[PDB]
Write a protein that binds this ligand. Structure first.
Ligand SMILES: CCCCCCCCCCCCCCCCCC(=O)OC[C@H](COP(=O)([O-])OCC(O)COP(=O)([O-])OC[C@@H](COC(=O)CCCCCCCCCCCCCCCCC)OC(=O)CCCCCCCCCCCCCCCCC)OC(=O)CCCCCCCCCCCCCCCCC
Ligand SMILES: CCCCCCCCCCCCCCCCCC(=O)OC[C@H](COP(=O)([O-])OCC[N+](C)(C)C)OC(=O)CCCCCCCCCCCCCCCCC
Ligand SMILES: CCCCCCCCCCCCCCCCCC(=O)OC[C@H](COP(=O)(O)OCCN)OC(=O)CCCCCCCCCCCCCCCCC
Ligand SMILES: NC(=O)C1=CN([C@@H]2O[C@H](COP(=O)(O)OP(=O)(O)OC[C@H]3O[C@@H](n4cnc5c(N)ncnc54)[C@H](OP(=O)(O)O)[C@@H]3O)[C@@H](O)[C@H]2O)C=CC1
Ligand SMILES: CCCCCCCCCCC[C@H](O)CC(=O)SCCNC(=O)CCNC(=O)[C@H](O)C(C)(C)COP(=O)(O)O
Ligand SMILES: COC1=C(OC)C(=O)C(CC=C(C)C)=C(C)C1=O
Ligand code: SF4
Ligand SMILES: [Zn+2]
Lengths: 43, 95, 178, 83, 118, 114, 339, 198, 385, 112
């Protein structure tokens, strides 16, 4: 009768796949930042 | 939880993930203790009829190993059918 | 169904844009900075530790913990020395010798659980017909001397009397399951 | 002293163990505690002592209270019943 | 090619047993009898050789039995008398075999109990 | 009879191997007493070697002898390639244990089962 | 009594319940070792905190060693310790008269009260230990006071064995370590340039085994055994030999004792366990007495063990990496003096 | 009652015959348990040959050695029963080849056929005492450095003959003959009544 | 070569390991691992113990994958008894088996990092591990060393709140793998420490009997969970994470994937667990219920005999292998008709792996050896047995 | 053609059909010395002949991989020469001979 069982209709869905986010500034844009610092810093 | 929004936003960003949605610390989501009393189901063999054990005792109906090639044209035979190649996954073949 | 981990599907030919992105990854340690962000993030999360003396890590009713011998509500100790708790103990921990008490009842003259020998399997809890020997909730019984850990009938019966109220509640919660 | 009259002799040395320590014993002794419970006056020749609490008690057994002189005593509880 | 040795396999030197327990231990090869309590005979089938019993002094702290003899609880089971004797000879333990004693055939017939004159 | 030879066809050839092992141990005793800082005398140790090599002097069968040196060689390896520390070596000397008398009267006075 | 059952090793029973008041000592450690090995019940009265007696726990088996809190000034503590013991062994001794305990106390006063109670208790035998060559007139207050005790205790406890050991040779001993530790001192003073004070060391174990054997033997009653040794020595060879195994230079320079008793007085003033003692100094140059007496070792069943044999173990810690591997064979032996 | 497919008891049975035919010089018995497991039994001399055929035969590739063990039937003249369990990742089947070795009649080593056996063979020598010729480095693996006796032999006492404690006098760990404070209670458990014809 | 032993007390030695290293300079030319420091006599003790009272021993051979270990003994004994566990029990064993592989992998990935020097991944996951033990404790009463998976069926039904709590853990666990994923999978420092270290070629891995993630990491496609489906591994869908090249990185990446694939299997088990009994209904094999033994004579006799004497499994012998988190864990149980076993050879994925250390750690520094042991996931309980 | 085989150590073998035909024909040759009715000769000759015939028949390696199984073609090459090595080994072993020695009696009786 009462035994521990999955809820009616089943449980919801669970994520297993890697969700690592590729979030970053683009490389060219990045270089410019550091280069700009040097360029200005030198001036 | 119980974190000022700003800390949460810093948290979510520095981590790169909505860590708030899936906090590790458990809060009032865990099964309450003293869950209701359990009436567990009785399995087969509890019938009061046509339940003869002799008809349900694989323990010793087992027999001594079958013997082949005792010391006391023909095609080649393998241990078993050659195995079947596994197939690449479809949800995530790579990575 | 299999899945290739670390298998590069194809040879992406370097494109300046790609090369720059990569070179920037090596030169300005971009991925290393990514890792620092993750740890800074948790620094801001609430720590999961508990004040150990003040707060206690949760243990549900089946926790085996420390051995105790129960008594009937009337006051008659439950054990009737059938001695199969001794038979099924995996470690040879329980030693029982018995003789008919003056009342004429069956009782154990000596019941000694060697807790250092015991591996807290909980089968004794299982095996007892009268359920006289139970796995009590307490886990904090660390002792200065080895002899204290060896337990005779009087310590276990006393352990039983001290924790009977919770033992009864715990057995009450889990008996339907068993 | 203990339930079984376990009392180290006046000369035994295990008494050194108890030196500067408490010899653990229980005041509540069963031989006596069962006595207090009164004989149950059932009105059926054979009654059963499930042990109190059914599954939470002791294996069920039926006692014959037919002997008029004596009273049936459950080999488990020690509880006594008379007709 | 095989070499010839008439020396009774004695391997007492390889078994690794302390000298005291190879020269002072007598083992008896016997077929176990049946505790009269039960009428089953499945424990009176295989021969067993058992080492001689030794000291079992009481322990002072807890009163548990204590034994100084390592080969006490060891009872090896051998299917036939010949094989068990062999184990004693190569291991160097002394042996004193006891012949199996099996119940003699007994004639029984329900009719007898109703005999005119018994 | 009719046994297969393990490594030595006859007690003669086998004895050759024992000689070699004895030499090995003899040459090694001194080193061990120094690399393990054991508190024993090289002479003393070398007698122990002799003791052991004779404790098994009675063996007449070639096969048993051959295994005995295999095993013996293994022990040496554990003591020259040092994996066996002092506790292990000194055990050979049975230094802590109290010697038991073998005199009947002695045993009678002490043990139920002699 | 306790019938002796078992094979002879730990977890076996020998039937000797024994209070041993000064077990924490160098000799003591050894006494508890054999008593525990044999399987005897050992009650160890202790005053130092539990941390320091842990070294005694692994010796002996469970429920075989019992530790009791005890104070020498408090008579009651000694009373309960011997309540259930049948053998009492007294090893109470010190070299430095401490602020609150005088040589009399450590040797004569206390060791009396102890045996006194032991009798009241009904202990079968009491073993009292006093230093060798202990005249009631000997120079060192220590030795004389000890002599005073061996007399008294006989009146409190008649037929009480009195083993009288020489200075003891063993790891953690003073006799051997003291001299070896003179290294710190650039020069090693030696009264009479270490001559005319022939000394006969005795291995600690021999002493211990002897003592233990006493406990389990009826032959020793009122006996005043003297565990001595396997060879005597002029202090010169001893000192050098030590320095020899220690592989440290030996520079014997004579020092007038009258001045040296003063050096002992100096360190003696030290608050933390003076290293040398005026009473020590005298003792060190106090010649070992000759061996005409109830024999000890051998007589009690243990053959003495020569000093050179185990010296390597006692003096090893004092060597330097350079000599650590060096062995006894490489080194030379000292010479005895039947004189 | 467990579900049993006779497809396997037939496939494996046939293979058994195939192996036997191909290696008749050594195969003595080849049986399939009621549990669908094959167990070619080979003369000890066939250790090298039978394994090699299974490791390198197109119709029977048995590449990895799952285990090498030695039951000890003291009654059996040849005390040990070296058992080698092998797996064929190609045909998804396992086979067991078991030989018999007495105490002083060594078996060949298969470290050549499978290098997995380098360790298990040392394990069998240490526990049971069987010796393996041509082994690269046979030496005790599991037992103590100075252990005397082979432990898993049925004739070896469980508690053993030596135990270790620290002795102050000698300031070093020291063996002593075993003295146990509660001997292993040897419950007799066999019932005097059999279960079935088997 | 400056012989130096990786002595037991050192943390990287897993408590008991005496790797006699020959250091040709810092480069190590030979390793001779001296195991045996934790041999407890597990397989000589089992011969003296009945089949139920030997179950506990199997929870202590690999001590980081308790239940999967006790699923190998349970399957063996069950085979020799020609009995099969009830349907609910088989799902529960698969549910607990994957919680154990997540538990072993969190152990293996985080402790490997502890050895290399990354300390934070261990702390984040270990909190996620006590969340998991709680599931053991709530179902068996022991945080670890449960004894829940019994030779026939499992011991007691799941408490009525466990499957909801396992969903909440599995729901949020993947972010936790994702988080160490970011902190230790692209760090040039990890990759450099792990990539191209201890490469093992495919045929060499089969020949050395590696049989585990070590087998799969070099590209051989073998999972005893799909090839020879034990229990219900035929009714659950998962992808074996085969790696390509074999460096200690590809093996790490495979272990991280198996944790993810196990969450996929755990999901299916919670979604599809059948109503039913947790232990086979043959009183001869599995002990009678508490109420029944206290009201029916046939049940007390069966409880008394089973606890005191035993199952008395029919005479035979079997080698049953299950995919334990480390690799193939197999029990060769030889059985006489007696209630206590005759032999129980525990094949330990680990005896084979540690043998490979000398070959795998070839031309490698002292530091590489620390990674080589870490990537074999060796627990000395299984190797020493 | 392929970039690499799944197995780490194995390397792509170009001209795989030619490499297999070389190995397969060799084995057939060695087997030619085995005793005529020797079981290994008849059985392996049958297996090897079928393998060649298929290798001769199929000009596409991917379908060749399907026809004689073997997973990647490179493995089949390793299996064939492994068998070639054993064929040479067994000729020396002479396992086609009768049983070396009967088992001591009661050697294989498990109930014991
Ligand atoms: C320094 C300036 C103040 C820093 C501060 O207030 O941080 C907390 C405050 C809230 O942070 P949170 O992580 O949401 O705090 C957890 C709960 O929300 C809030 O935690 P709660 O719910 O426990 O709130 C009660 C808490 C409230 O305590 C506070 O929030 C103030 C703490 C001030 C620390 C200084 O008070 C306490 O529990 C006792 C501890 C009080 C501070 C103890 C340390 C004082 C150090 C003094 C010398 C430095 O930080 C911010 O508002 C944003 C800071 C962004 C930094 C970049
Ligand atoms: C407020 C606290 C801010 C903490 C910031 C670091 C932790 C959060 C990181 C979040 C994250 O994951 O993004 C990283 C991101 C993640 O990017 P990624 O590695 O995923 O890829 C993006 C870059 N491409 C695509 C080109 C490969 O890393 C970067 O954006 C680049 C960081 C470059 C850092 C260069 C070294 C440090 C700067 C040195 C110069 C001095 C600067 C000032 C020093 C202090 C002066 C006072
Ligand atoms: C004109 C100039 C144009 C732009 C030039 C950019 C110059 C960058 C200066 C540093 C260069 C470092 C570098 O080139 O990388 C070396 C190493 C990563 O190189 P690697 O991946 O090993 O490449 C292998 C090739 N042999 O780099 C490393 O290993 C980094 C290891 C770092 C470990 C700690 C990292 C901490 C990172 C956060 C703090 C960064 C500093 C911020 C504060 C600076 C002071 C305020
Ligand atoms: N070379 C030698 O050692 C020789 C020794 N002896 C005798 O043998 C006996 C043992 O010698 P040894 O072991 O070296 O002596 P130790 O200096 O080692 O001390 C012996 C024990 O006596 C205890 N003790 C000392 N003073 C007191 C006190 N006032 N109250 C209570 N307990 C005390 C100490 O306990 P704690 O440390 O806890 O205070 C210690 O455990 C001595 O009595 C000595 O006279 C005789 C000849 C030579
Ligand atoms: C100091 C450390 C002590 C360590 C000592 C050493 O390592 C231990 C050891 O001797 S290792 C076992 C040696 N044991 C053999 O090598 C077998 C000898 N075999 C025989 O003795 C035969 O009976 C024979 C026919 C040769 C008699 O001939 P003979 O009397 O020797 O000549
Ligand atoms: C996970 O593998 C193992 C470790 O390394 C990370 C160990 O440290 C240890 C022991 C480590 C200490 C010092 C607690 C064990 C037992 C182990 O199994
Ligand atoms: S089983 Fe329960 S009742 Fe029977 S003896 Fe052990 S404890 Fe006493
Ligand atoms: Zn009742």
């Amino acid at each position: 009768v009462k035994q521990d069982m999955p809820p009616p209709g089943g449980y919801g869905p669970i994520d297993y796949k890697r969700n690592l986010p590729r979030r970053g500034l683009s490389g060219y844009s990045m270089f410019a930042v550091g280069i700009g610092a040097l360029i200005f810093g030198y001036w | 939880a119980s974190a000022t929004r700003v800390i949460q936003k810093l948290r979510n960003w520095a981590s790169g993930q909505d860590l708030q949605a899936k906090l590790q610390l458990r809060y009032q989501e865990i099964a309450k203790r003293t869950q209701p009393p359990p009436k567990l189901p009785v399995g087969p063999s509890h019938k009061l009829s046509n339940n003869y054990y002799c008809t349900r005792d694989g323990r010793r109906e087992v027999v001594p190993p079958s013997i082949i090639m005792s010391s006391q044209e023909k095609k080649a035979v393998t241990p078993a059918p050659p195995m079947k190649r596994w197939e690449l996954s479809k949800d995530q073949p790579y990575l | 169904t299999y899945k290739y981990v670390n298998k590069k599907e194809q040879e992406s030919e370097v494109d300046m844009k790609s090369a720059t992105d990569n070179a920037a990854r090596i030169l300005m340690w971009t991925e290393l900075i990514r890792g620092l962000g993750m740890t800074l993030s948790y620094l801001f999360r609430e720590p999961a530790t508990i004040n150990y003396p003040f707060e206690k890590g949760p243990l549900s009713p089946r926790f085996r913990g420390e051995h105790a011998l129960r008594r009937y509500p009337s006051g008659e100790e439950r054990c009737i020395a059938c001695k199969l708790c001794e038979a099924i103990c995996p470690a040879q921990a329980i030693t029982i010798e018995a003789e008919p008490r003056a009342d004429g009842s069956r009782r154990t003259t000596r019941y000694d659980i060697d807790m250092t020998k015991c591996i807290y399997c909980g089968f004794c809890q299982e095996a007892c017909p009268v359920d006289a020997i139970v796995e009590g909730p307490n886990f904090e019984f660390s002792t200065e001397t080895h002899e204290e850990l060896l337990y005779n009938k009087e310590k276990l019966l006393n352990n039983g009397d001290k924790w009977e109220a919770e033992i009864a509640a715990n057995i009450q919660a889990d008996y339907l399951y068993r | 002293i203990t339930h079984t009259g376990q009392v180290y002799d006046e000369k035994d040395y295990r008494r050194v163990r108890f030196v500067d320590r408490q010899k653990e014993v229980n005041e509540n002794f069963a031989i006596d505690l069962i006595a207090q419970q009164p004989v149950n006056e059932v009105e059926h020749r054979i009654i059963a002592c499930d042990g109190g609490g059914g599954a939470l008690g002791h294996p069920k057994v039926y006692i014959n209270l037919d002997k008029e002189t004596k009273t049936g005593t459950c080999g488990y509880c020690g509880l006594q019943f008379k007709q | 090619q095989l070499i010839t040795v008439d020396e009774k396999l004695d391997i007492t030197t390889l078994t690794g047993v302390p000298e005291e327990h190879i020269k002072t231990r007598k083992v008896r090869i016997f077929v176990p009898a049946r505790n009269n309590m039960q009428s089953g005979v499945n424990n009176t089938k295989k021969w067993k050789m058992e080492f001689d019993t030794r000291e079992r002094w009481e322990n002072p702290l807890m009163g548990w039995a204590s034994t100084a003899d390592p080969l006490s609880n060891m009872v090896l089971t051998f299917s036939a008398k010949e094989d068990a004797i062999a184990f004693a000879e190569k291991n160097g333990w002394s042996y004193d075999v006891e012949e199996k004693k099996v119940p003699k055939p007994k004639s029984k017939s329900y009719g007898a109990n109703f005999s005119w004159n018994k | 009879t009719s046994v297969k030879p393990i490594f030595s066809r006859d007690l003669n050839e086998a004895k050759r191997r024992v000689r070699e092992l004895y030499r090995a141990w003899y040459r090694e005793v001194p080193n061990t007493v120094h690399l393990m800082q054991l508190d024993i005398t090289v002479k003393q140790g070398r007698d122990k070697v002799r003791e052991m090599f004779m404790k098994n002097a009675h063996v007449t069968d070639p096969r048993v002898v051959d295994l005995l040196v295999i095993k013996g060689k293994m022990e040496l390896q554990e003591t020259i390639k040092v994996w066996k520390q002092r506790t292990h070596v000194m055990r050979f000397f049975h230094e802590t244990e109290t010697p038991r008398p073998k005199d009947f009267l002695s045993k009678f006075y002490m043990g139920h089962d002699p | 009594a306790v019938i002796p059952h078992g094979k002879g090793g730990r977890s076996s029973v020998s039937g000797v319940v024994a209070t041993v008041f000064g077990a924490t000592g160098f000799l003591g450690r050894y006494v508890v070792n054999h008593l525990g090995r044999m399987g005897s019940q050992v009650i160890i009265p202790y005053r130092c905190d539990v941390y320091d007696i842990m070294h005694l726990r692994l010796m002996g088996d469970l429920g075989q060693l019992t530790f009791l809190e005890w104070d020498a000034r408090d008579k009651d503590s000694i009373r309960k310790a011997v309540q259930h013991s049948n053998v009492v062994i007294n090893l109470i001794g010190r070299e430095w008269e401490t602020r609150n305990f005088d040589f009399e106390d450590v040797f004569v006063n206390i060791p009396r009260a102890i045996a006194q109670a032991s009798k009241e208790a009904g202990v079968e035998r009491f073993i009292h230990v006093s230093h060798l060559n202990a005249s009631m007139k000997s120079s060192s207050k220590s030795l004389r006071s000890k002599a005073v005790g061996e007399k008294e205790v006989r009146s409190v406890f008649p037929e009480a064995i009195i083993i009288r050991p020489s200075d003891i040779f063993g790891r953690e001993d003073r006799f051997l370590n003291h001299f070896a530790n003179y290294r710190w001192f650039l020069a090693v003073p030696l009264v009479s340039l270490g001559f005319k004070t022939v000394k006969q060391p005795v291995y600690v174990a021999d002493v211990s085994k002897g003592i233990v054997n006493a406990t389990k033997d009826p032959d020793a009653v009122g006996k005043t055994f003297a565990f001595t040794g396997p060879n005597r020595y002029l202090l010169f060879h001893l000192v050098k030999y030590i320095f020899g195994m220690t592989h440290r230079t030996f520079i014997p320079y004579p020092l007038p004792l009258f001045v040296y008793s003063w050096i002992g007085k100096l360190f003696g003033l030290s608050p933390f366990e003076p290293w040398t003692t005026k009473d020590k100094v005298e003792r060190i140059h106090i010649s070992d007495v000759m061996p005409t007496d109830l024999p000890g070792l051998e007589d009690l069943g243990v053959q003495p063990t020569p000093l050179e044999l185990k010296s390597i173990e006692v003096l090893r810690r004092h060597r330097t990496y350079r000599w650590l591997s060096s062995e006894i064979e490489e080194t030379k032996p000292a010479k005895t003096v039947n004189y | 009652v467990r579900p049993r497919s006779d497809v396997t008891h037939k496939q494996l049975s046939a293979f058994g015959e195939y192996v036997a035919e191909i290696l008749p010089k050594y195969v003595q018995q080849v049986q399939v348990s009621c549990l669908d497991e094959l167990e070619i039994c080979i003369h000890p001399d066939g250790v090298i040959p039978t394994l090699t055929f299974l490791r390198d035969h197109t119709n029977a590739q048995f590449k990895s050695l799952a285990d090498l063990t030695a039951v000890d039937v003291p009654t059996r003249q040849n005390r040990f029963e070296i058992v080698y369990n092998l797996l064929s990742l190609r045909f998804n089947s396992r086979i067991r080849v078991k030989t018999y070795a007495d105490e002083l009649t060594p078996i060949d080593s298969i470290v050549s056929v499978h290098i997995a056996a380098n360790w298990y063979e040392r394990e069998v020598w240490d526990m049971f005492g069987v010796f393996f010729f041509n082994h690269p480095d046979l030496r005790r693996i599991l037992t103590d450095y100075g252990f005397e006796g082979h432990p898993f032999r049925k004739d070896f006492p469980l508690t053993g003959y030596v135990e270790l404690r620290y002795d102050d006098e000698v300031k070093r760990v020291v063996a002593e003959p075993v003295e146990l404070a509660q001997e292993f209670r040897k419950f007799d458990l066999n019932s005097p009544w059999e279960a079935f014809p088997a | 070569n400056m012989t130096l032993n990786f002595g037991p007390q050192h943390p990287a030695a897993h408590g008991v390991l005496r790797l006699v290293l020959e250091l040709s300079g810092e480069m190590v030319r030979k390793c001779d691992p001296h195991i045996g420091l934790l041999h407890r006599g597990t397989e000589k003790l089992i011969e003296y113990k009945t089949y139920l009272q030997a179950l506990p021993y199997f929870d202590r051979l690999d001590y980081v994958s308790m239940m999967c270990n006790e699923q190998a003994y349970s399957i063996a004994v069950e085979k020799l008894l020609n009995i099969q566990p009830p349907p609910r029990a088989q799902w529960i064993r698969v549910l607990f088996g994957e919680i154990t592989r997540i538990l072993n992998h969190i152990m293996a990935v985080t402790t490997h990092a502890l050895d290399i020097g990354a300390m934070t991944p261990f702390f984040w996951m270990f909190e996620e591990r006590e969340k998991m033990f709680e599931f053991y404790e709530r179902v068996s009463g022991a945080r670890m060393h449960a004894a829940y998976i019994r030779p026939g069926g499992v011991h007691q039904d799941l408490p009525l709140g466990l499957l909801d709590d396992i969903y909440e853990f599995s729901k949020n666990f993947s972010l936790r793998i994702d988080e160490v994923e970011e902190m230790l999978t692209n760090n040039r420092i990890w990759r450099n420490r792990t990539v191209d270290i201890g490469v093992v070629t495919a045929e060499d891995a089969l020949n050395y009997g590696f049989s585990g993630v070590m087998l799969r990491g070099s590209g051989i496609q073998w999972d005893l969970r799909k090839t020879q489906p034990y229990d219900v591994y035929d009714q659950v869908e998962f992808d074996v994470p085969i790696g390509s090249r074999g460096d200690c990185y590809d093996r790490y990446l495979c272990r991280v994937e198996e944790m993810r694939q196990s969450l996929r299997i755990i999901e299916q088990c919670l979604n599809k667990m059948p109503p039913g009994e947790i232990k086979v209904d043959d009183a001869k094999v599995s002990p009678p219920k508490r109420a029944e033994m206290k009201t029916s004579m046939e049940s007390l006799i069966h409880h008394f005999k089973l606890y005191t004497e035993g199952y008395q499994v029919p005479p035979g012998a079997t080698y049953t292998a299950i995919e334990a988190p480390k690799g193939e864990f197999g029990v060769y149980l030889v059985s006489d008709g007696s209630s206590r076993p005759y032999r129980c050879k525990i094949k330990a994925p680990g005896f084979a792996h540690l043998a490979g250390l000398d070959k795998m750690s070839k031309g490698h520094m002292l530091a590489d050896v620390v990674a080589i042991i870490g990537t074999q996931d060796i627990v000395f309980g299984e190797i020493d047995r | 053609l392929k970039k690499t085989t799944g197995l780490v150590g194995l390397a792509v073998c170009d001209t795989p059909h030619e490499r297999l035909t070389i190995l397969y024909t060799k084995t057939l040759d060695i087997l030619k010395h085995f005793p005529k009715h020797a079981a290994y000769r008849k059985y392996t000759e049958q297996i090897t002949n079928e393998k060649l015939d298929m290798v001769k028949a199929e000009p596409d390696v991917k379908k060749l991989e399907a026809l004689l199984q073997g997973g990647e073609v490179e493995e089949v090459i390793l299996q064939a020469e492994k068998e070639l090595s054993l064929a040479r080994k067994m000729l020396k072993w002479k396992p086609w001979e009768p049983l070396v020695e009967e088992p001591p009696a009661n050697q294989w009786k498990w109930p014991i």
